[PDB]
Design a binder for this molecule. Structure first.
Ligand code: A1AS2
Ligand code: A1AS2
Lengths: 306, 306
């Protein structure tokens, strides 16, 4: 038992991280087969950041303008191209550590592990959710651009995120690995800002089920609710609507605990309307929304990865 | 910016995990050079758990009674011995993935990363602290015994923990890698229980410094306090005493923020006496005590590992 914000083992991703330098800008790249992926703003100067024409900037570069270090060993760049907001640096060596992988784009509300990286050297690993407003509450300093987010299914790494930029509120924005931004953000200096967020209702319910599995029951009650009555309360507290598909996804957890989904919704309604009265749930005095139903089943059942 | 409970990259440890089977008991082992380390209770039956004489049980075993799987490849056991509460299984192959390592024992209050494992297959990674009562608030199911805890310094893995057992409150007990238990726990079935815990005061102060670095300042005040006056308040709230060495360790953080350590103590005193009044700090409505001053400097400065 127990419940922790748990990331996937990072080893398969560690073997892909490299350091990309262009001019006086160094950041991280992702080395899969013979291609290094990195944010295209690596080619920009400080004044270029202001209003860049990336096609213009790139045509003026050469393969030799890109320095790629894989550990203490240089990789020769033999081609370059731009795909949306990522650069693809063609290298003369396939990464022997390339795991089985996919490039997938995730939904707001879904979670992933981040391998934070500096100078192509991995620094730490942690678990994130894609917020409904398409930002992530990460932990990133200067030089972390090009660190990636991922999930692991059996032996296959599904890459979903590449870090590009920090927004003024201290949250983070980036792209999928095809170079398409999550949310309405661009890789140039504007006054761009996150915009309003909401709480991920289905994830809160999953976490309440995790708590029951782990022995916190004080928030349970005999009452129930209809889906609509619940969603009227959720809207008032800036929670997103709960769908019948969310209810179905919560079925297995509902069955293992014997608490009907709609009964849990009654409990959540009471918690939103009354707070916690100085009590905690799974060591938190806040309702946690960064665990999906899948994450709860994984950790309260014991699925590994090979 | 940002602040996350961040674990070390796990890749170096993933390459050491193996599956150990004895009779009908399977658990995890740690494979370094040509030795596999695992909890000695692997040799126990259900009735053996009751009051085992481990020397007696071990002399009745043979090398061939131990099945070791490294991936889909069996390792031949060529010797066995007991060192305190761990078994040392001598295998005929040195692990080519053996990183540079040390066996270190940590202090209560210190943190480490856990690579949770099942059937020798890593499942997730997360960050833990050694509680003052020598338990850890982990996340472990059946089959996780022999999962290890570690830290990384540059390129060297310092192993500090091996998982043995879950206590009735759902917390976890184990040994260092020499087989010596953390705290007053034994590897046999007794009614053993955790015993009273306290909050790690120096870690809370470090986390308050992390919050200031990240822009939460609402809990700051003009007041200050003496160390003794502070410790009188800390004792009342079940916090451990703050020493002059703790104050010195907090110096760098104090200097970067310009908040004297004793001024931060005044802020903590006020938070303990008044609560948070519905506000949060680094996304928490509780005072967090599982980040050390070292962890805060690492993440608010950007140190990596090679
Ligand atoms: C990557 N290593 C770094 N990000 C950038 O350099 C990125 C890049 C410019 C400006 N970038 C930013 O992230 C923002 N700038 C912004 O204009 C905006 F809108 F707020 F996002 C700054 C934080 C530098 C002001 C372009 C968008 C092309 C990076 C990555 N992660 C975290 C960082 C920090 F916390 C601090 C500084 C750089 C960071
Ligand atoms: C390891 N895979 C497993 N632990 C044991 O099997 C371990 C071993 C017996 C009993 N063990 C326990 O962890 C406790 N038993 C206790 O007597 C006590 F005191 F509470 F710790 C049980 C949870 C099984 C009752 C001996 C001590 C020799 C293990 C590891 N981690 C988590 C587990 C669970 F959450 C549930 C079951 C086994 C767990």
């Amino acid at each position: 038992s127990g419940f922790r914000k748990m990331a996937f083992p990072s080893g398969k991703v560690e073997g892909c991280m490299v350091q990309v330098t262009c001019g006086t800008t160094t950041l991280n790249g992702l080395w899969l087969d013979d291609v290094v992926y990195c944010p295209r703003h690596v080619i920009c100067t400080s004044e270029d950041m202001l209003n860049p024409n990336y096609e213009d900037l790139l045509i003026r570069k050469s393969n030799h303008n890109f320095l790629v270090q894989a550990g203490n060993v240089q990789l020769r760049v033999i081609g370059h191209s731009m795909q949306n907001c990522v650069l693809k640096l063609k290298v003369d060596t396939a990464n022997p550590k390339t795991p089985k992988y996919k490039f997938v784009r995730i939904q707001p509300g879904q979670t992933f592990s981040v391998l934070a990286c500096y100078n192509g050297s991995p620094s730490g690993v942690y678990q994130c959710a894609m917020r409904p407003n398409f930002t992530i509450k990460g932990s990133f300093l200067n030089g972390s651009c090009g660190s990636v987010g991922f999930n692991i299914d059996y032996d296959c790494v599904s890459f979903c995120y590449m870090h590009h930029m920090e927004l003024p509120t201290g949250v983070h924005a980036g792209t999928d690995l095809e170079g398409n931004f999550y949310g309405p953000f661009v890789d140039r200096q504007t006054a761009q800002a996150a915009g309003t967020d909401t709480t991920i209702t289905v994830n809160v319910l999953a976490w309440l089920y995790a708590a029951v599995i782990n022995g916190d029951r004080w928030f349970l009650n005999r009452f129930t609710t209809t889906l609509n009555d619940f969603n009227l309360v959720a809207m008032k507290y800036n929670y997103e609507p709960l769908t019948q598909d969310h209810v179905d996804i919560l079925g297995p957890l509902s069955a293992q605990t014997g608490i009907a989904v709609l009964d849990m919704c009654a409990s959540l309604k009471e918690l939103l309307q009354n707070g916690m009265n100085g009590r905690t749930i799974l060591g938190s005095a806040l309702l946690e929304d960064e665990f999906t139903p899948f994450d709860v089943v994984r950790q309260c059942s014991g699925v590994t990865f090979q």
